[PDB]
């Protein structure tokens with residue numbers, strides 16, 4: 001969760017295992033930034049606004 | 050540091066990463082089909098290679114589950130999909146050639162040569178056999194066309210059946226089951242649910258139940274054939290006997306679509322067909338799709354989203370670009386749906402696209418659902434809604450609001466018998482084979498059939514139970530349950546089995562609510578909000594609840610109805626009673642090509 005009226009920083013790389021990554025990449029989880037695949041056939045709700 | 054704590058977040062995160070890769074596979078299908086590039090050909094294969102096998106790597110920690118109750122959501126049902134391990138139980142050396150042997154006969158069947166006398170011209174199974182199906186009145190050609198195909202390859206198909214059953218059953222043994230048929234019942238399996246639980250083996254018995262309503266349909270047609278087909282083929286058609294399967298428009302008798310030639314009502318009255326009378330408003334390729342769009346408001350189905358206008362082609366390419374005649378529509382979601390034919394100015398575009406119409410409108414009803422549960426009440430629901438309204442798309446009396454009817458209604462029977470019998474040809478010829486094939490798989494899966502009664506009984510039961518004749522029986526020299534792609538690749542008919550009768554009930558649901566009595570060809574489905582309200586519930590309910598609850602709601606009766614099947618063609622069946630009341634009913638099992 002985020003607090004109201006404050007800006008979000010997305011830096012931490014999440015790991016599925018609750019043990020810390022400790023600077024080592026893990027499996028089954030990746031960088032939490034999602035690049036939405038934008039096709040012209042997407043619905044208006046799916047379309048970015 | 051709990052593994053359950055890991056899995057709780059991991060499962061939620063996985064469903065979104067999965068969808069991005071799942072969506073890409075269907076998109077490359079058309080792009081590869083129009084220009085083949087190195088990137089284009091590999092897109093679907095490398096996209097889907099991280100779905101099935103890679104699932105196990107994410108699924109390893111799904112076996113640590115506990116009698117924890119916190120899972121009460123439909124999640125438990127996706128959780129079973131998270132518990133799948135795949136074919137990892139199989140050894141690599143025994144599965145190395147399993148893929149090779151599985152598709153070996155598919156190449157031979159596709160690359161098959163039919164021997165012809167004097168080798169006048171090249172011949173092929175499809176469409177060469179269907180092209181000259183009724184070109185001449187030679188029994189010898191009809192026999193030899195299939196006899197040569199069998200004598201080409203069918204003897205060598207026997208070794209295909211050895212490892213197939215063992216490997217198929219080994220999945221059940223690895224999955225703490227004795228039979229794989231009980232593993233196929235995962236969509237029909239529900240547990241820890243009060244009064245809404247169904248058993249996997251119960252769906253075993255319907256084969257006996259479903260054939261009670263099949264014989265009445267076959268009996269009425271046989272009386273009609275008895276009148277007319279003796280003159281054309283008197284050497285192999287006896288009135289008190291089984292209707293021959295080697296004189297119809299089929300190589301194996303599966304689809305009895307080409308029965309109009311042998312069952313034409315009158316040879317002096319041509320059927321009504323208007324083509325030039327319809328073109329007075331400059332009929333073009335766009336006219337058919339415009340009328341299809343107008344069909345939407347007469348069925349209350351909403352118009353499909355922007356995907357209708359870009360992914361679907363509605364005109365000829367006009368260039369050297371080659372298009373796919375086979376429709377390609379997938380439930381990707383997010384507005385990606387297709388209606389694709391070999392789009393030209395053709396009358397077939399009227400019907401084939403309509404077949405996809407039900408396949409379109411259903412998907413947006415549960416597209417918002419996760420891909421793991423992106424389906425209807427059962428597997429046959431997807432293919433059921435696409436054909437129920439297709440019957441109304443060919444009747445022009447239901448097309449009063451089309452503007453092309455000129456409703457000078459003919460004097461009922463006199464005309465309708467000519468047209469309606471054609472539609473009867475759809476409902477008669479596919480029941481027996483679907484009935485007989487589905488039985489064989491279930492008995493062979495458990496293994497209670499002995500080897501001495503596993504091969505010969507395939508033809509022994511055929512003469513007595515269904516009542517059909519074959520051109521050449523196969524005892525221990527041809528493997529009849531090895532000549533089909535479905536058998537050679539471990540496919541079943543559960544896709545066509547549940548909806549076979551339920552489609553008629555679905556179509557009757559649109560009229561029973563509307564308080565319509567009589568034959569179902571004069572039902573008005575226009576501007577009806579009662580039917581749309583009923584149709585908009587279970588379309589969007591999806592798979593969230595157990596299918597048992599939805600089964601009671603959708604049909605309203607726990608048993609099967611036979612009067613709706615006989616009520617759409619009431620004049621057709623009634624008229625044959627007068628001319629056949631003073632005759633022997635049924636067929637005699639004594640006479641058959643057993644010897």
Ligand SMILES: *[C@@H]1O[C@H](CO)[C@@H](O)[C@H](O)[C@H]1NC(C)=O
Pocket residue numbers: 462463464466467624
């Ligand atoms: C339908 O029944 C009527 C009743 O007399 C009959 O005149 C007509 O010939 C019948 N139609 C056919 C196609 O047999």
Ligand SMILES: *[C@@H]1O[C@H](CO)[C@@H](O)[C@H](O)[C@H]1NC(C)=O
Pocket residue numbers: 573575576
């Ligand atoms: C539906 O058809 C027209 C709407 O165009 C309307 O006049 C009619 O009353 C409606 N109901 C029936 C049963 O036709």
